[PDB]
Amino acid sequence: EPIRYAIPEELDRGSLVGNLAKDLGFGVGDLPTRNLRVIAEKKFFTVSPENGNLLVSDRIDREEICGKKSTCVLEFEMVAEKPLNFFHVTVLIQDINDNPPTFSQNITELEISELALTGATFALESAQDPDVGVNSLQQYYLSPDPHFSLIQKENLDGSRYPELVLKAPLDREEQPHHHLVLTAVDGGEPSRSCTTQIRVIVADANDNPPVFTQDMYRVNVAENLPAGSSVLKVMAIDMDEGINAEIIYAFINIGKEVRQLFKLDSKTGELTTIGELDFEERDSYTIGVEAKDGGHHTAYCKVQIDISDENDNAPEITLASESQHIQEDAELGTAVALIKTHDLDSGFNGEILCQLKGNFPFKIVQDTKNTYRLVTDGALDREQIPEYNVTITATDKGNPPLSSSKTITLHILD
Amino acid sequence: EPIRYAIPEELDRGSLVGNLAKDLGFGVGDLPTRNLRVIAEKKFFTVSPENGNLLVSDRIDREEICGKKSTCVLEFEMVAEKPLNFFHVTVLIQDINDNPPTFSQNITELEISELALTGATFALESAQDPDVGVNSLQQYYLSPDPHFSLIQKENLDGSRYPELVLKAPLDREEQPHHHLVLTAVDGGEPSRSCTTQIRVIVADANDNPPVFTQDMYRVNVAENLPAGSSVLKVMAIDMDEGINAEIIYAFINIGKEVRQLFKLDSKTGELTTIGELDFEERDSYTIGVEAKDGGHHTAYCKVQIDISDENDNAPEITLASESQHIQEDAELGTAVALIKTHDLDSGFNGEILCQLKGNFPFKIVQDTKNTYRLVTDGALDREQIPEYNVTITATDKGNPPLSSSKTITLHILD
Ligand SMILES: [Ca+2]
Ligand SMILES: [Ca+2]
Ligand SMILES: [Ca+2]
Ligand SMILES: [Ca+2]
Ligand SMILES: [Ca+2]
Ligand SMILES: [Ca+2]
Ligand SMILES: [Ca+2]
Ligand SMILES: [Ca+2]
Ligand SMILES: [Ca+2]
Ligand SMILES: [Ca+2]
């Protein structure tokens, strides 16, 4: 007694579903006398009491009725009169591919670090299709990109979902963004399609250690350099981004001799002096510099600071004599006093020229480069001149030249 | 004429350096008459005018005089009288191993990430030795540790510096700290030594992706569940530290049908309901959950939420008749009205028991599980009772049971 029909959805009003009169043993000779009607909470079908045909009266949208059910059937009752009887009529609504696939968003972003190995799989969002059956099964295609490809797997129910695969390593320092296009095409007639853009943001990874612009920082300064003066500036380049590019500079393998003399900026890398340079104490400094980032990648270089000799030391004079006593009967050339000179500076700043300032019966006789001898070159007499105030002046050959004066009293004994 | 001596440093006062009288052709017969003296800005040596010997007068510290020079010589002048002459005396001070090595700090810290490959080299700070020669060359020894070893290289000048090498991979999740002891021993007699402790801090690396406690979160709720009620709580474990352990929870591959129904906490991972559940619309929800950390490591699990059927729908009654008109001459059993019942709920909540509330000359005759027929079971007469107000009550078999009342007026025609 029950009867089932099968019509496609989205049929215009008046489309023939079937002949309920012919298909139930109802002769037309008593059709209007039985008043064939259709009772239903949702009025989707009507019956013409003239011929007994079951037609449609409203829009039959399968997605509004059943949704995503595999089978969409409608069960209503038909009422006849004289006598009153019920006729259960089932109507299976067939699904047509009238709805295209849709992604949740037109543009989707994905963050992938540079450390993604070749072959890494990244999950993608599947497209939804309001239809069922073959009109809902999707085929996913990715636009050709030399870095990314697409693999398509199936679930247990047969539904297909895309997954992004990496076929080329990602280098943010070469290309931080990748624009892909994913297209979902269902397997119905006609084949409806939709596209979406995938913005792949290459996340930074600490894979580039710091690199100094110079493997050796060699500079020459003077020892009279004041404290705090700028000596040089080391520079390191880190091609990464953010914390993986911030560089801190610091000294390594250093001692208190150099720690109390120089200062390295932890941010700008400027090398200054916190102490006093002295060419006589140390003429060359070799310091190791460390460049470290957030990823603990270290870079090492050496800095050599040369110091020039400045004429900041005056020649001192050392004298010696036989209790600074001279016999008035001494012969010409008798050693009266011994002179020793030395200058702490090097080069021509250390060479000394000793002079005899004044007019005395003596003369300077050079023996070595630093030892002089004061001999007699005139007559002596206690009752005439009892004492001589001999002044010795030694001047270096630097620029500006410095000198010192050493006066010794030489008594004349009888 | 110049003469050079060679004595070790740190000699007590009165130690014999040499016989300047014997070594310069000076007979003792005229030794005190020449008054042998030593002129020097830094008084380190003296000469006894009785025998002509050159002795020491103060502490001879080679580190205070020359520092770290390879050769430490002292050049002073000797003064003789009658006649006055100069005698240049050179004294080479030999270095003794009287100073032990020293590190810049007793405890040094080093940060090494877990990604350090087997064989990675890490620079160490060398020990300083105030002496020179073999008394300054250091031998570095590291305490045996199954993770670290020591390699020793030489510079161009022959000085030796230690470097730390990694022979076993570092896992912070297994051991975040490593306590090492580095010892520096110089090559002098006696061999002086010093130690230092190296605190190796294993820096964290995002190498542990999130892991869910359950690969499947299956729960069953009721459709009358209010909005905002706690459904379940997903949990992910990240064994890393800091940013590499903070986990965010979010839905993946979801649509507006489920997005408008549930809410996943991005921090606590608690799943709540922002919509109204309906067993008649959908009975099971399958949602994908993503667990992502700072290192972009993803973890995926599925959550299945089942819904129980609640008796929240009352059975509705559909009636039909021949214009609700009855002939008073109708035979017993004539179909007067047609009854159709259906309940949207499932199970026993959907099964319906139709009753005939009141006393009328009619009775309910069941045809199918949902269709009833009201037939005649008594006499009829228009002039006696012209109309009947038949009340139909249909009650479901749920808990609590719900029911509806449908009253139709049936006129008696003559
Ligand atoms: Ca449709
Ligand atoms: Ca459809
Ligand atoms: Ca479709
Ligand atoms: Ca890179
Ligand atoms: Ca990078
Ligand atoms: Ca870096
Ligand atoms: Ca100076
Ligand atoms: Ca100088
Ligand atoms: Ca000078
Ligand atoms: Ca010493």
Ligand SMILES: [Ca+2]
């Ligand atoms: Ca020494």
Ligand SMILES: [Ca+2]
């Ligand atoms: Ca030593």
Ligand SMILES: [Ca+2]
């Ligand atoms: Ca680990």
Ligand SMILES: [Ca+2]
């Ligand atoms: Ca870790």
Ligand SMILES: [Ca+2]
């Ligand atoms: Ca992690």
Ligand SMILES: [Ca+2]
């Ligand atoms: Ca409900």
Ligand SMILES: [Ca+2]
């Ligand atoms: Ca229900």
Ligand SMILES: [Ca+2]
């Ligand atoms: Ca019910």
